[PDB]
Ligand binder design. Structure first.
Ligand SMILES: C[C@@H]1CCC(O)=C(C(=O)SCCNC(=O)CCNC(=O)[C@H](O)C(C)(C)COP(=O)(O)OP(=O)(O)OC[C@H]2O[C@@H](n3cnc4c(N)ncnc43)[C@H](O)[C@@H]2OP(=O)(O)O)[C@@]12CCC(=O)O2
Ligand SMILES: C[C@@H]1CCC(O)=C(C(=O)SCCNC(=O)CCNC(=O)[C@H](O)C(C)(C)COP(=O)(O)OP(=O)(O)OC[C@H]2O[C@@H](n3cnc4c(N)ncnc43)[C@H](O)[C@@H]2OP(=O)(O)O)[C@@]12CCC(=O)O2
Lengths: 295, 247, 295, 247
């Protein structure tokens, strides 16, 4: 008959998530984050999350809503001034989240282990650093069964698999079955997030038929196949205010406004009232109005 | 007449002397000028990127595009790190006497008093390949006795019985005051040169610990005429370098 | 001044190799093998080699000249009838080579370990199979420091790094500095062979300037950068008689003639006299003549 | 009237019953027809490739191209293998009573009496995901007491204390004589059905070991009218299937 139609709404997708899940979030810093999916999380009652991410304003917004219990990350950055995300910083200085901070290469390594259903992969990164102190006994070493030529055996970090209950990623183009592509210079790690996860949700700028997808991009850009996706969300401008490859750049003015609004109770209630108290369409209309007013 | 920032630029170029055919990864404006200056003078085989995902064929001015020669997305950077064929120049909120470095946060690990980036790639950088540091304002708050969080691995962390540590190498620290390495006794912070006009007392008053060889350190070399031309006319005609170099 | 000019001849490249080396050969089966470089090996006195390969007629020709002491491979196949390479089969049935046969995924794994300068990577493939008997104590296991949820710890194959003294690969386009690209549907593993090796030689169909290279192929096809290559050889039709992506398909008629000629002393002396007793240009002229005669 | 090869085709389709959204990887013509037949009837979410590097959107006839839906180069196949989301149908020079399989060589490991492919992907396939086998000529030389070289892992190799073995699963063996699995006592080769016209004595005379349940095995089901149409008109109009199925 027919392959499964995986098209769902933003609120449908978050409706499949549960409090207490370990969720990986794709993109990188302020780059192609599934921000519409994150805003849908904020509207929901899903909380007590363990988040695995190369962190940016996705983690900031989740922290603004108290939705993060534990975070696994290589960094958190807005990629532009003021660089440090102010909501992540507040959660940290308040001790509201338990962190398993790690080297950026360890995130990739851990996702790769989960993708291959392995319990660990060895890695040098982490040795001799306070990554050991962030993790304590959750991060162990592994000794090579093969000594080096000199007769000494290497002891490496055993990076444990970063198994995910769910993954949220945003891509530029996809079909209704989960085939999806990036456009632009970097896939980041969204394929690894999907491969490491049980439930996989991809938002895309535009849903097209399969044949249009494969004629629009090179083979190498088709980074998700149907085995890697459980739900597809059509979300134009769904990475705003992060950049999104060839679709659009970062909304630098609006990101600055987000960061400044976090500074006081007063400024944040107004940001929430204007941008985060309605639907994705309401958000998109308000963001467009902001850009016109600030020209 | 040569400005303080111009001495810093050639010192940052000298970081890469003898580097050969490796990826130069400067993480601030002065090291960026330095790497590109080296590539245009004595290290043409350096690989450099646009800071995002493209490997440059030619050497462009700060902020400019150039024709490309290859692809370097973030996932492939981690392959380069693990291969060892790289020399990164990072910044630092803190550096101690043995080269431990912090860009993560201040205060306790699970409840810091100030949040920065987290450890980023600093652990993997310092354990895999040559790492150098740039400090635009040399102070005792940066050069401290103990860093709060070890994101960059220093020499007193090394286990000589475990060959997993054998690629660690901290090459230089360049600051607005001079050029330093960790070649002092017990791999301690050591002065190689002071920029013209900088006194030993100025360095000592702005470093929390004793600096090896400080009294005998000479003055940073003069840039060549070619280096001054490349800095002032080709690489940084708007003098963006001045914005980063304190006094 | 200038980046290093790495252009060298076929015989120059083999002139950098030494008897006793461990050499990885790129491509896959009868697909984009560096056959011109292999023929240059045959003309040389380099022998006693340890070869790491997804084997095809490259390994067959080396075995026809007694140049292989030890072979690490996931398979050997001509990819068309008669499928089994007859020179590899003769070396095997005569016990002339020591084999470390392994699962195909283990080759990839071992090259990845060498590329990352790790002594091993864990892998499931190999467990419970006679791969253990091919390797004996050269292949050991490694136990996870993290038990699974049930409390049981996984014991996996510790695939040792496949460190190479040299790598030989063939690609479709490159510049004089070692930037190089494949054209067609599959890069195979040539980037991993180069990353695992000390000395790296790439033959290419055509050497072009860097700017022409990067305007001809997508970013994702630029699989070798300058840090991955020590010598560049211009060798048009240099993968013959294997296929080579978009440049050409397999010369099926000529491969069949190679396989049939291996059957008797008599047939092989004639094959050697016609195709392997002169230069690459002599070979290419003879192959063209064969195609005209057999139309 | 239904030919022996047509029964083999629907038996190969039934291999994938309930497979869901996984990569079907048939390695011979009859399993290929079977996988594509399943995809056109009751398993539309199967992924299939062109046998080289392209994932097909539509289901083409044997040897035909079809519009594509994704990329699957060999390096990414090994990612799929390790993910478990695959069901391969391999051939076999030898299969024993517990499912050990050989496609590598005959004779001693380091000096065989006959060379074939080497182990290929058989070890990784059998330890990671469902694996089935196709045998076009069922004989006692194929179905033997002991395989010379274990390339495909059988049930008597499994270590139940080591969870690294937990994904092993040999689903079916389909031959020109019938449909089999390893559901007999102690995971032994067991008859599920015999193709019409095949007798128990014919199977017994052509298998070196005893086949569990042979005396009680029923006959392979009839193809539906739709299945016959798809086999004869859409997937294999030239009857390439007949070339592979002995007697
Ligand atoms: C993908 C790859 C992976 C591998 C790789 O290699 C990558 C990396 O990325 S690897 C990361 C490299 N990245 C860096 O190297 C960044 C280093 N950082 C900087 O360069 C900063 O810019 C800076 C250090 C110059 C200044 O930072 P800063 O502003 O935070 O500090 P500073 O100004 O000194 O003020 C300090 C303030 O704290 C106050 N204070 C001091 N004590 C305390 C205390 N106990 N408690 C509370 N406050 C305090 C003080 O009163 C000041 O408060 P205040 O001013 O009074 O309010 C890649 C490449 C591309 C990519 O994407 O990844
Ligand atoms: C990339 C991925 C990685 C993962 C994956 O999954 C992949 C694989 O690839 S995974 C591999 C899958 N591949 C298969 O499944 C191939 C299985 N093989 C076949 O299908 C064969 O075709 C065959 C079995 C049907 C017939 O083979 P055969 O011809 O050798 O045997 P047979 O005809 O029975 O004659 C036997 C002859 O030996 C004689 N003899 C018998 N005893 C002996 C004895 N003691 N000594 C000497 N001779 C003997 C007998 O007298 C006959 O001699 P003779 O005839 O008298 O001369 C992928 C996918 C795509 C890719 O690229 O990799």
């Amino acid at each position: 008959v027919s392959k499964r139609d995986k098209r769902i709404s933003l609120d449908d997708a978050v409706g499949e998530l549960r409090s207490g899940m370990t969720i990986g979030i794709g993109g990188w810093g302020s780059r192609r984050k599934p921000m519409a999916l994150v805003r849908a999380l904020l509207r929901s009652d899903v909380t007590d999350l363990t988040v695995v991410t190369y962190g940016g304003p996705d983690l900031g917004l989740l922290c603004s809503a108290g939705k993060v219990t534990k975070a696994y990350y290589g960094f958190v950055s807005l990629d532009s001034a003021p660089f440090y995300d102010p909501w992540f910083a507040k959660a940290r200085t308040a001790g509201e989240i338990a962190v398993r901070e790690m080297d950026e290469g360890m995130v990739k390594c851990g996702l790769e282990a989960a993708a291959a259903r392995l319990p660990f992969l060895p890695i040098r990164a982490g040795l001799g650093s306070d990554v050991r102190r962030f993790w304590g006994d959750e991060l162990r070493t592994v000794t090579s069964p093969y000594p080096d030529a000199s007769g000494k055996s290497e002891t490496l970090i055993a990076m444990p698999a970063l198994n995910l209950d769910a993954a949220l990623v945003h891509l530029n183009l996809g079909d209704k079955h989960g085939n999806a592509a990036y456009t632009g210079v970097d896939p980041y790690f969204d394929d690894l997030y999907c491969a490491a996860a049980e439930k996989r949700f991809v938002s895309v700028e535009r849903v097209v038929e399969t044949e249009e997808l494969v004629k629009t991009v090179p083979l190498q850009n088709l980074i998700l196949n149907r085995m890697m996706v459980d739900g597809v969300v059509e979300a134009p401008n769904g990475a705003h205010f992060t950049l999104a490859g060839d679709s659009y750049g970062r909304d630098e003015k609006f990101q600055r406004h987000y960061a400044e609004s976090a500074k006081t109770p007063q400024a944040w209630q107004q940001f929430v009232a204007t941008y985060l108290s309605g639907s994705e369409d309401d958000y998109q209309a308000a963001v467009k109005k902001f850009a016109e007013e600030q020209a | 007449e040569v400005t303080r920032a111009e001495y810093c630029a050639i010192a940052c170029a000298d970081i890469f002397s003898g580097a050969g055919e490796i990826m130069a990864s400067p993480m601030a404006t002065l090291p960026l000028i330095g790497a590109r200056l080296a590539r245009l003078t004595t290290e043409p085989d350096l690989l450099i990127t646009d800071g995002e995902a493209l490997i440059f064929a030619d050497t462009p001015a700060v902020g400019a595009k150039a024709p490309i020669e290859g692809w370097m997305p973030f996932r492939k950077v981690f392959d380069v790190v693990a291969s060892g064929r790289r020399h990164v120049v990072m910044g630092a909120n803190q550096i101690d006497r043995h080269g431990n470095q912090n860009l993560s946060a201040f205060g306790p690990l699970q409840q810091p008093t100030r949040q920065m980036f987290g450890v980023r790639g600093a652990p993997g950088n310092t354990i895999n390949h040559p790492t150098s540091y740039w400090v635009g304002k040399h102070t005792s708050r940066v050069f401290c006795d103990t860093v709060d969080i070890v994101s960059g691995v220093g020499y007193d962390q090394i286990d000589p019985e475990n060959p997993a540590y054998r690629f660690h190498h901290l090459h230089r620290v360049v600051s607005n005051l001079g050029v330093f390495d960790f070649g002092g006794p017990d791999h301690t912070f050591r002065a190689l040169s002071l920029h013209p006009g900088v006194t030993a007392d100025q360095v000592a008053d702005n470093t929390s610990f004793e600096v090896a060889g400080l009294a005998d350190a000479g003055v940073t070399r003069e840039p060549t005429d070619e280096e001054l031309r490349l800095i002032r006319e080709v690489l940084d005609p708007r003098s963006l370098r001045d914005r980063e170099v304190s006094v």
